[PDB]
Amino acid sequence: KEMPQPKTFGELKNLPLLNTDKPVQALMKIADELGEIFKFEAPGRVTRYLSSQRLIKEACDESRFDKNLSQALKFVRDFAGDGLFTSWTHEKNWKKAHNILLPSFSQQAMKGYHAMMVDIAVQLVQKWERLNADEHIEVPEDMTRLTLDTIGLCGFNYRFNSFYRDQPHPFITSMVRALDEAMNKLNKRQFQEDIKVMNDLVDKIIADRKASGEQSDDLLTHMLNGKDPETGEPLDDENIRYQIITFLIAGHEATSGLLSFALYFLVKNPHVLQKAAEEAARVLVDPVPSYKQVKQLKYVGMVLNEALRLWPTAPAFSLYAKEDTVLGGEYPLEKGDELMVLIPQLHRDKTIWGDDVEEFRPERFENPSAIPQHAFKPFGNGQRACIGQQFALHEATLVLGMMLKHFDFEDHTNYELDIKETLTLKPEGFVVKAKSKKIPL
């Protein structure tokens, strides 16, 4: 009835406990010790971290709780503005952009993005085909080049050409710098300059596109042509800019993390790699994968969901109570009280997944309808769930399928998993060697 709480440090309350490079991983250990709910205080602030499916299912009831803008999201809003990710559900622009963009992110819409995804995926595979025998792959680095360039191409038909450079395109440098600064706040001169670099490029492309009248298969065309069904209003140019920034900010790192963790688990589990590779060989019979082929990569899809189970790459989200309510029959909350969903702990709930939760077993996802509601939430919840979920999974399934078709992989360093935390998670320093199977591409 009384909620556990970890060590306090006087006026600093619990804050010193997150004085670490790996706060989510620290929080998982606190959850291991304290159980399914604990209080966590800082000077300004109180939240309650939830870890069990029993309480998280209640937290996911949208009549009772809505998305909160956590401090991290408030700092990100300095450059992501009122784009979808950093808006309250009640802001007019959240609803407008959500209504306009939702069908442009459906599974069906992936058919329209597929050619541009393949363009970047082929660039990645060709890079690896072109390595000499003495060389190796920097996995999260190459995965981030791929996802950034894919979201730039599908997002606004802009080529960052990340596979042509050691130093990233200057927009990328400013975006990555801007993100780091917002996370570190949890400089100012550089922050403003980096914001300006982002707005300038994105505003220019928007202005260029409106001028030429060109129609493309990208999200920018959808946003220039879209009208909110409720009001009949379009998004204005400022908000369109924030959405483009948001697709890059929200999408690039979580998706490259997922591809990196999935390859990690595959090289650490050779039997699973071989089963995934046999499927990729059977299904991807053409030098350029089709949309329909990617959809037949069922076990690759299971591999990706099981990677998201263990290390969901956007690991926590924040909610507030809409009205006074009692959580789990035991914990009274007041209107506005905050909850944090700790997704890696949720995904380790032994009452749902059985005792073997640390084991990498894609077969858990063989029958998606036996996973209970709200047991598996790597893309968040309800109407504030990831709008990019189909995009991320189509991209990851395509790319992983191709990697497994085209190369054998060696964990040549016997890499020890080290999870770096930013807004997202990734296996820092993960490296492999890939030997080409010499299959046409």
Q: Which of residues 86-115 bind ligand HEM (CB under 6 A)?
A: 98
- Binding of residue 250 to ligand HEM (CB under 6 A): yes
Q: Is there a contact between 79 and 195 (Cβ–Cβ < 8 Å)?
A: yes
Tell me: does residue 116 bind ligand HEM (CB under 6 A).
no
Candidates 28-36, 172-180, 250-258, 408-416 — which segment interacts with ligand HEM by CB under 6 A? 250-258
240 sits near ligand HEM (criterion: CB under 6 A): no
Q: Give min distance, CB of 220 to ligand HEM, in A.
A: 13
Query: Within 10 Å of residue 190's Cβ, how many Cβ atoms?
Result: 12
d(CA 297, CA 140): 22
Burial class (CB in 10 A: 0-12, 13-18, 19+), 158: buried
Residue with tokens 């009280």: 337
Contact predicate 353/347, CB 8 Å: yes
Residues of each annotated binding site for (9Z)-hexadecenoate: 49
- Our finding on whether 224 is near ligand HEM (CB under 6 A) is no
- Among 53, 144, 162, 246, interactor with ligand HEM by CB under 6 A: 246
Rounded Cα–Cα distance for residues 2 and 380 (Å): 27
Q: Which residues contact 19 (CB under 8 A, 6 or more apart)?
A: none
Residues 378-407 that bind ligand HEM (CB under 6 A): 378-380, 384, 386-388, 391-392
Select 31 or 308, whichever has its Cβ closest to ligand HEM: 308
Q: Coil, helix or strand for 103?
A: helix
Q: Contact with ligand HEM (CB under 6 A): which of 251, 301, 344, 362?
A: 251
Q: Which residue, 81 or 378, is less far from ligand HEM as judged by CB?
A: 378
**CA distance readout (Å), 199 to 119, 237, 240:** 26, 11, 11
List, in order, residues 6 or more apart from 316 with CB less than 8 Å away.
Answer: 24, 27, 340, 341, 342, 343
Nearer to ligand HEM, 312 or 362 (CB): 312
Site for ligand HEM in 47-86 (CB under 6 A): 67, 84-85
Nearer to ligand HEM, 82 or 194 (CB): 82
Q: Is 305 in the site for ligand HEM (CB under 6 A)?
A: no
257 vs 289 by CB, closer to ligand HEM: 257
Q: Is residue 23 within 8 Å of residue 421, measured between CB atoms?
A: yes
Cβ distance to ligand HEM smaller for residue 125 or 219: 219
Footprint on residues 170-209 left by ligand HEM (CB under 6 A) = none
Torsion region of 297: left, alpha or beta (phi above 0 gives left; psi -120 to 50 gives alpha): beta
C-beta separation of 315 from 340 below 8 A: no
- Nearest distance, CB of residue 428 and ligand HEM, angstroms: 18
Residue 18 per-residue DSSP state: G
**Which residue carries 């995934």 as its tokens?**
276
Stretch that binds ligand HEM, among 17-25, 290-298, 375-383, 400-408 (CB under 6 A): 375-383
Binding residues (CB under 6 A) for ligand HEM: these are 67, 84-85, 98, 151, 246-247, 250-251, 254-255, 258, 312-314, 317, 378-380, 384, 386-388, 391-392
